[PDB]
């Protein structure tokens with residue numbers, strides 16, 4: 001479909017070029033590449049831009065990088081409807097991330113619901129709301145703006 | 149009062165020696181030191197052990213290091229009763245940390261209350277409960293255990 005350069009991706013998703021390069025180096029995001037040269041050689045898909053938008057949003061919660069990476073991996077594997085363009089934003093489900101003390105399973109991801117979320121807080125557990133619709137709305141609005 | 153070596157501090161608070169060295173290097177915690185030599189030369193106070201316990205607990209929430217450091221600085225300045233041994237644990241107030249998107253003020257700290265905390269979650273805001281009493285209880289129990 002539509003492909004975007006690194007500077008275009010950086011400006012659309014409000015990730016710095018330095019962040020994109022680091023996330024490429026670490027395998028967080030895998031844009032399409034070709035041999036090195038003076039011309040453009042790295043291109044992000046719309047799904048990559050969505051992954052960038054997720055990563056920037058997770059990092060804005062204060063969550064450490066390793067857990068943001070783990071969250072993005074879990075979202076892409078377990079919640080692929082987030083990246084599908086199948087579900088219109090009105091029907092996407094809001095989620096919540098619950099960090100744990102288990103190195104093997106360091107992050108729980110669940111559907112958001114107020115009763116369970118408030119119960120977790122009253123037990124002393126950190127809750128990180130993750131509004132799937134806002135994610136997709138934010139990229140869509142950055143992109144509609146991007147042309148103009 | 150009582151002073152503890154780095155290995156004693158590491159084992160009491162379940163921070164690795166590598167973490168203590170890094171937090172010393174960065175100024176997170178400032179144990180008492182003297183000139184270098186073959187003998188012991190770094191000593192943690194009970195208040196330092198409390199600061200270590202806070203730092204290990206904040207890092208367990210998933211909060212990134214810079215914000216844990218900022219949280220510890222804000223707690224020591226704004227909530228010195230946490231480190232005073234004034235308030236018995238039964239009267240210490242539970243808190244909550246709310247990470248923000250402002251670089252100048254990247255973290256809000258507030259008294260915990262369920263109504264406000266649930267309202268923040270429903271608005272999409274991350275909430276990190278911080279149980280002051282559990283902090284002081286945990287070190288006290290690690291220390292009562294430590295002798296035996």
Ligand SMILES: Nc1ncnc2c1ncn2[C@@H]1O[C@H](COP(=O)(O)OP(=O)(O)OP(=O)(O)O)[C@@H](O)[C@H]1O
Pocket residue numbers: 101123124125205277278279280282283286
């Ligand atoms: N919100 C909080 N603020 C401060 N300390 C906390 C908070 N939540 C948990 N802790 C501390 O984290 C440690 C582990 O807590 P948690 O209840 O998850 O496990 P635990 O009860 O030690 O596990 P186990 O059931 O295996 O003994 C405990 O020492 C607890 O005091």
Ligand SMILES: Nc1ncnc2c1ncn2[C@@H]1O[C@H](COP(=O)(O)OP(=O)(O)OP(=O)(O)O)[C@@H](O)[C@H]1O
Pocket residue numbers: 057129130131132134135138249271272273
């Ligand atoms: N829980 C969440 N999940 C996903 N995206 C979120 C969540 N909370 C906030 N955002 C996104 O973070 C960005 C900033 O949110 P916030 O409401 O704090 O500020 P804002 O409304 O952009 O600020 P202003 O009032 O200055 O325009 C928004 O794009 C919003 O969509």
